[PDB]
Design a protein around this ligand. Structure first.
Ligand SMILES: CC(=O)N[C@@H]1[C@@H](O)[C@H](O[C@@H]2O[C@H](CO)[C@@H](O[C@@H]3O[C@H](CO)[C@@H](O)[C@H](O)[C@H]3NC(C)=O)[C@H](O)[C@H]2NC(C)=O)[C@@H](CO)O[C@H]1O
Ligand SMILES: *[C@@H]1O[C@H](CO)[C@@H](O)[C@H](O)[C@H]1NC(C)=O
Ligand SMILES: *[C@@H]1O[C@H](CO)[C@@H](O)[C@H](O)[C@H]1NC(C)=O
Length: 370
């Protein structure tokens, strides 16, 4: 019963040419869940982020028409949304409750199967209580609307950080575990353009030369920290990135992990954002000349460089390494960010969706059990 929850970003539809991804481009046998990102809050009511999104919701739903057991969720929050929107929504019980009863109306109207909360991030005691308070009302009201209607309950999931620091600052793990259906651990962005050193986006294990703090910034330690803090293993969906984090090298000579960088590398031609790159953009970069491909046998992930350009990413191999690890640890499934940044056009040379397909064939036959 391993679950595969795939985030679909709404702004990928605004990509230039080949890059452009519509809910039509989703393979409905790929994932078990499709999470649309993101909605927004307007006057503390779950609402559309643009009037162009309303029809988008309709087409990400009715993917069920090609796979009737596929679940379609709406995600709110995100890295850009911030905290302040949730801090406010969460200051009076009437504001909260009303958001809940009406989000239910909003979701049931679009035929959504549930809601994903991506508050990034709660910090501090009062924030912790609010996050529990919110997920509690949502879950308990979903359980109630299941009673009072004649329908199967709406799902409640949440995206949560990987950092052991972030876990402690804003997450009552035993409590949110009780009310959440799935716990989507964002096990990526360990390193990026916000640093002046070259580091990998999502390393499974650490370098043996790493400090004891750096040894905690891995997929392995973060997932096991959540377990350590009381997260049930069958609810833990470990995040798998279909993107890499790119760097501009201060020096073309130093390309090893830890090499100085001045910032993010050249933006991808489609994603239009430095320091990051989609997988179909990675393959492009790999087919350049004098582009070197390295495999980190300690961290069990690849990275590539050309001239001053450095990128660390996940391929078919590293992700399969991660599925082997995930099954040995006994986690309930995976979470993907994002489906629209995997090679959905099979232009890397491999098949369509090489990354998510690689993880899927490796999770085949697997049953969650302790
Ligand atoms: C569950 C999860 O992964 N959540 C986090 C994500 O929110 C985050 O993805 C980043 O999301 C922001 C929005 O929060 C993206 O900004 C968008 O950037 C595009 C192009 O860069 C820009 O046109 C848009 O204005 C903006 N979106 C909107 C509509 O606001 C950002 O690019 C996303 N990054 C990636 C890699 O997809 C990622 C990682 O930052 O994962 C979690 O952090
Ligand atoms: C790049 O690094 C090497 C050492 O690895 C150093 O000797 C060289 O001077 C650096 N490049 C420049 C332009 O300084
Ligand atoms: C890049 O330069 C190195 C020599 O430093 C060479 O080994 C390699 O073949 C070149 N090209 C590629 C595609 O790796």
């Amino acid at each position: 019963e391993p679950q595969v929850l795939c985030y679909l970003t709404s702004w990928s539809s605004k990509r230039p040419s080949a890059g452009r991804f519509m809910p039509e481009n989703v393979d409905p046998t790929l994932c078990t869940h499709v999470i649309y990102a993101f909605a927004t809050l307007k006057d503390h009511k779950l609402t559309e982020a643009d009037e162009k999104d309303a029809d988008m919701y309709d087409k990400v739903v009715a993917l069920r028409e090609k796979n009737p057991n596929l679940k379609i969720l709406l995600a709110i929050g995100g890295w850009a949304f911030g905290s302040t929107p949730f801090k406010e929504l969460t200051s009076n019980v009437f504001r909260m409750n009303q958001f809940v009863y009406e989000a239910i109306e909003f979701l049931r109207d679009y035929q959504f199967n549930g809601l994903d909360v991506d508050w990034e991030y709660p910090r501090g005691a009062d924030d912790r209580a609010a996050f529990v308070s919110l997920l509690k009302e949502l879950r308990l009201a979903f359980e109630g609307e299941a009673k009072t209607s004649g329908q199967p309950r709406l799902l409640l999931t949440a995206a949560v950080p990987a950092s052991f620091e972030a876990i402690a600052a804003g997450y009552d793990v035993p409590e949110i575990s009780k009310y959440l259906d799935f716990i989507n651990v964002m096990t990526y962005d360990f390193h990026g353009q916000w640093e002046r050193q070259v580091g990998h986006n999502s390393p499974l294990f650490p370098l043996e030369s790493a400090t004891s703090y750096q040894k905690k910034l891995t997929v392995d330690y973060s997932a096991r920290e959540w377990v350590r803090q009381g997260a049930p293993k069958e609810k833990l969906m470990i995040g798998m990135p279909t993107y890499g984090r790119s760097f501009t090298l201060i020096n073309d000579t130093q390309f090893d992990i830890g090499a100085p960088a001045s910032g993010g590398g050249q933006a991808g031609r489609f994603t239009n954002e430095a320091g990051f790159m989609s997988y179909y953009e990675i393959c492009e970069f790999l087919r350049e000349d004098n582009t070197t491909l390295v495999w980190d046998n300690e961290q069990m992930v690849p990275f590539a460089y050309r001239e001053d350009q450095w990128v660390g990413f996940d391929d078919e191999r590293s992700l399969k390494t991660k599925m082997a690890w995930l099954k040995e640890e006994g986690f309930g499934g995976i979470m993907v960010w994002s489906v629209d940044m995997d090679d959905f056009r099979g232009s890397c040379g491999t098949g369509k969706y090489p990354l998510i397909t690689a993880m899927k064939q490796e999770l085949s036959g697997y049953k969650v059990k302790l």
